[PDB]
C-alpha cells in the first residue's frame, strides 16, 4: 500500500552536491511528518533529518553531522520529499532511505519512530571516477556434463561506483540465481551472478544475463553459448 520511491543517488566528489527525491503514494502525505535515514556500508542506521507537516509549519530538524550542509524539504502537491545535500564528505557515503514518521502520538505514543521505509538510494562520495564494468559470460567447457542440471554465470568486472543489477531472461528465471556481493579490488569493484536450470532446457533454449550499471548508463546482455 504505502510506497516511498527514492531516486537521485549517485557518485559525487568531496565538497560536491546532490539532491535526492522520494515519491510517496498510498497514504495521505500532507498529514505526516517525513524523515531521511541513512546507512553507511556495513554499519548501523543513522537518522538524518525530519520535516513536519504543514499543520506544524514544516518545522525541520537535522542530525549534528549534517546540520547546515543538508536541507530537507517537501512538495505536498506532488507528494514528494527531498534532501538537498551540499559540501559532501566521504563519510556521507551511504544508502539513504525515505521514511514516513509514525502517526498520531495520542495513539502511537510521543516517542518518535519510523513506520514505513523506502528501499533506498545509494550515495557514494569519492574522488574516484565512474567506470563502467566489463561483462564476461561463464559457460561450462566441453569436458564433462551432469544429466540433472547445469549452472551458468556472468562476471562483472572493474566498475565504479556501486552498484549493478544482474537479471536473467528479463526476470523470468529467478531465485535459481545467486548474486555474489561485489568486492573492492584496487579501487574498482567486481561481482558475479549464477543461475541454475534443468540441463534439457539449455542450450536448446536461450539463457541471457542483463547487466545494468546506472551510474555509467550502461546495460550489457550476454547470451550464453556452449
Amino acid at each position: 500500500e504505502v510506497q516511498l520511491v527514492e531516486s537521485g543517488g549517485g557518485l559525487v566528489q568531496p565538497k560536491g552536491s546532490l539532491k535526492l527525491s522520494c515519491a510517496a503514494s498510498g497514504f495521505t502525505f500532507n498529514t505526516y511528518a517525513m524523515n531521511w535515514v541513512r546507512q553507511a556500508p556495513g554499519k548501523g542506521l543513522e537518522w538524518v533529518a525530519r520535516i513536519r507537516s504543514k499543520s506544524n509549519n514544516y518545522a525541520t530538524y537535522y542530525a549534528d553531522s549534517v546540520k547546515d550542509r543538508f536541507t530537507i524539504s517537501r512538495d505536498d502537491s506532488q507528494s514528494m520529499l527531498y534532501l538537498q545535500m551540499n559540501n559532501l564528505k566521504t563519510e556521507d557515503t551511504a544508502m539513504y532511505y525515505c521514511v514516513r514518521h509514525r502517526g498520531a502520538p495520542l495513539y502511537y505514543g510521543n516517542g518518535a519512530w519510523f513506520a514505513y521505509w523506502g528501499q533506498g538510494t545509494l550515495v557514494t562520495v569519492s574522488a574516484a571516477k565512474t567506470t563502467p564494468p566489463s561483462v564476461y559470460p561463464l559457460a561450462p567447457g566441453c569436458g564433462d556434463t551432469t544429466g540433472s542440471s547445469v549452472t551458468s554465470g556472468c562476471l562483472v568486472k572493474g566498475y565504479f561506483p556501486e552498484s549493478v543489477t544482474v537479471t536473467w531472461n528479463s526476470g523470468s528465471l529467478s531465485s535459481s540465481v545467486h548474486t555474489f556481493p561485489a568486492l573492492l579490488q584496487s579501487g574498482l569493484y567486481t561481482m558475479s551472478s549464477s543461475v541454475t536450470v534443468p540441463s534439457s532446457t539449455w542450450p536448446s533454449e536461450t539463457v541471457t544475463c542483463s547487466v545494468a550499471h546506472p551510474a555509467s548508463s550502461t546495460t550489457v546482455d550476454k547470451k550464453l553459448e556452449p
Binding site: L45, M95, Y97, R102, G109, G111, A115, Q119
Partner: peptide, 17 residues
C-alpha cells in the same frame, strides 16, 4: 523501538514504545 532489516536491505518496524 525495534526494526528488522532483511538481507536484501528492506526495513520494517516490529515493535514500538
Amino acid at each position: 523501538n525495534w526494526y528488522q532489516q532483511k538481507p536484501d536491505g528492506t526495513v520494517k518496524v516490529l515493535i514500538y514504545y
